Design a protein around this ligand. Structure first.
Ligand code: 842
Ligand code: ZN
Ligand code: ZN
Ligand code: ZN
Ligand code: ZN
Length: 388
């Protein structure tokens, strides 16, 4: 488990999430597992399903122990039901350590598994706070760090229907995965990997919104979501501005809805008419920020003699979700030990002829804590005690 043994340990199909090979149980059962920075539960298929041809067989594992507890987890469209337990977990193209972790054995599901995905489970790498059924269910990464000598840090280089590749570096930073300098934004609160966006530009033009609209009701880094998602108001401003630059082409509304492809003749796509998008993230120094710059090659997704494209930016009512669309630009450091997220330009350069994906700063201004929104506290959340 040198960083070199972890290089290129990810695979997937385009728009269907990235997965790492894990083993579960004794003897080890090999399974492919979606890497989700947007959730906190480790769960694996554990009974027959249409789209699966292997699953976790609890009864074949000598190290399995029943927790006698059910759990239910909805996501944006998919959901599953599970029965909790613990077993030995390893990442074979990862560090050379085995840990006892919590596993949700999935017994029923709806629209969870995706035909052709090649994944049989989901690794929630976010914090205990949002774990189901409550935060006393230690997440995998927590266990791994608690039980071994692995630094409290991981890094994602997501690259590339068509196949994708990439790397999850568990426990450090591999400099062969990036070029230029690494910029860190703070983790605002440890639940999701919540960050603050202080400014947005499309083709250098500021959208000029109250900076709180950008993080309404939050902003996060989610390897589990394909698209860049944007709060309704920001989405509308953004589309207006993208439509205006690309206006030599007149697409049907369904395209802007992300529900329809548009096509040019093989190798003739007019990239230049689509604008770069810059997201300015709060720096570690007060009044400083730095931008990540997104190419239309990242947000226009490839799907006769024709190159065809899906619009990978969609509306949100649950804040700004920086999905795979965004991450594919970058080597992203989830530096849990220092409560920061780093970005650098990826050594998998998914690059334009005149423009490039960029991580740039500092930019200096005023009043970024002012850009956070505070979610309305519900009675249900206020009432649960936390003797942890
Ligand atoms: C598209 C999708 O849904 N992706 C799953 C991962 C995923 C990928 C996939 F390919 C199929 C799936 F069903 C789920 C990912 O977590 C979604 N993450 C958010 C989400 C949304 C709703 C519930 C939960 N959540 C549950 C527990 C803790 N948080 C998380 C995080 C907050 C903002 C919106 C997306
Ligand atoms: Zn392998
Ligand atoms: Zn059921
Ligand atoms: Zn109490
Ligand atoms: Zn608690």
């Amino acid at each position: 488990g040198s960083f070199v043994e972890m290089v290129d340990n990810l695979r997937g199909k385009s728009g269907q999430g990235y997965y790492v090979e894990m083993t579960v149980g004794s003897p080890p059962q090999t399974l492919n597992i979606l890497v989700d920075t947007g959730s906190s539960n480790f769960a694996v298929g554990a009974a027959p399903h249409p789209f699966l041809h292997r699953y976790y067989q609890r009864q074949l594992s000598s190290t399995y122990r029943d927790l006698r507890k059910g759990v239910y987890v909805p996501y944006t469209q998919g959901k599953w039901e599970g029965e909790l337990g613990t077993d030995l977990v390893s990442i074979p193209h990862g560090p050379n350590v085995t840990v006892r972790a919590n596993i949700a054995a999935i017994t029923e599901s709806d629209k969870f598994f995706i035909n052709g995905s090649n994944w049989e489970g989901i690794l929630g790498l976010a914090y205990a706070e949002i774990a189901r059924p409550d935060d006393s269910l230690e997440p995998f990464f927590d266990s791994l760090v608690k039980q071994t000598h692995v630094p409290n840090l991981f890094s994602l280089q997501l690259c590339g229907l068509a196949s994708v590749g990439g790397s999850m570096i568990i426990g450090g930073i591999d400099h062969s995965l990036y070029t230029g300098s690494l910029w860190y934004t703070p983790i605002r609160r440890e639940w999701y990997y919540e960050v603050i966006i202080v400014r947005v530009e499309i083709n250098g033009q500021d959208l000029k919104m109250d900076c709180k609209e950008y993080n309404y009701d939050k902003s996060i880094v989610d390897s589990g979501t394909t698209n860049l998602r944007l709060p309704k108001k920001v989405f509308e401003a953004a589309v207006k501005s993208i439509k205006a630059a690309s206006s030599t082409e007149k697409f049907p509304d369904g395209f802007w809805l992300g529900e329809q492809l548009v096509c040019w003749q093989a190798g003739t796509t007019p990239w230049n008419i689509f604008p770069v998008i810059s997201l300015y993230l709060m720096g570690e120094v007060t009044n400083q920020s730095f931008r990540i710059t997104i190419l239309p090659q990242q947000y226009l997704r490839p799907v006769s003699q024709d190159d065809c494209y899906k619009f990978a930016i969609s509306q949100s009512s649950t804040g700004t979700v920086m999905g795979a669309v965004i991450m594919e630009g970058f080597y992203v450091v989830f530096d849990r030990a220092r409560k920061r997220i780093g970005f650098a330009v990826s050594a998998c350069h998914v690059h334009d002829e005149f423009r490039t994906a960029a991580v740039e700063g500092p930019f200096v201004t005023l009043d970024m804590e002012d850009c956070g929104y505070n979610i309305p506290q519900t009675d249900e959340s206020r009432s649960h005690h936390h003797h942890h």
